[PDB]
A paper describes a structure:
The RGD (Arg-Gly-Asp)-binding integrins αvβ6 and αvβ8 are clinically validated cancer and fibrosis targets of considerable therapeutic importance. The highly homologous integrins αvβ6 and αvβ8 bind to latent transforming growth factor-β1 and β3 (L-TGF-β1 and L-TGF-β3) leading to release of active TGF-β1 and -β31–3. Here, we describe a method for computationally designing hyperstable RGD-containing miniproteins that are highly selective for a single RGD integrin heterodimer and conformational state, and use this strategy to design inhibitors of αvβ6 and αvβ8 with high selectivity. We found small α/β ferredoxin folds were able to scaffold the RGDLXX(L/I) binding loop without clashing with the integrin while making additional contacts with both α and β subunit (α- and β-loop respectively).
Following two rounds of design and optimization (see supplementary info for details), two high affinity variants were selected for further characterization: B6B8_BP (av6_3_E13T) and B6_BP (av6_3_A39KG64R). Affinity maturation identified a substitution to a lysine (A39K) making a salt-bridge interaction with E316 of the β6 subunit while the LXX(L/I) motif remained fixed confirming the importance of this motif for selectivity towards αvβ6. In B6_BP, the β-loop is positioned to confer selectivity between the two integrins, where residue K39 faces E316 on the β6 subunit and K304 on β8. B6_BP binds αvβ6 with a higher affinity than αvβ8 on the surface of K562 cells, with a Kd of 0.11 (±0.09) and 580 (±40) nM, respectively. As intended, B6_BP is more selective for αvβ6 than B6B8_BP. B6B8_BP and B6_BP do not cross-react with RGD-binding integrins αvβ1, αvβ3, αvβ5, α5β1, α8β1, and αiibβ3 at concentrations up to 200 nM in cell surface binding experiments using K562 cells stably transfected with different RGD-binding integrins, corresponding to >1000-fold selectivity. As B6_BP binds to A431 cells with higher affinity and is more selective than B6B8_BP for αvβ6, we selected B6_BP for further in vivo experiments. AF680-B6_BP rapidly accumulated in the αvβ6 positive tumors and reached a high tumor-to-muscle fluorescence contrast ratio within 3 h post-injection.
Numbering used by the authors: 0 to 65
The structure:
């Protein structure tokens, strides 16, 4: 699956960086990339994808199960 986080406002870059550092610790094996205000996690299990969405529930996110 794929999770995409979209960060908003004047702090978006710093919040992305915070979330990115956190997720690199949760899943050192996850393929994590970012550009602009979007953070993308690939190679994550669909159930783990709903978990990290639920961990940062106020960050807008999408999940692609395919």
């Amino acid at each position: 699956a794929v999770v995409r986080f979209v960060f908003r406002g004047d702090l978006a870059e710093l919040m992305l960086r915070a979330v990115k550092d956190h997720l690199k610790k949760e899943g050192p094996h996850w393929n994590i990339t970012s550009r602009g205000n979007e953070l993308v996690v690939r190679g994550i299990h669909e159930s783990d994808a709903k978990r990290i969405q639920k961990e940062f529930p106020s960050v807008q996110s999408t999940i692609q199960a395919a």
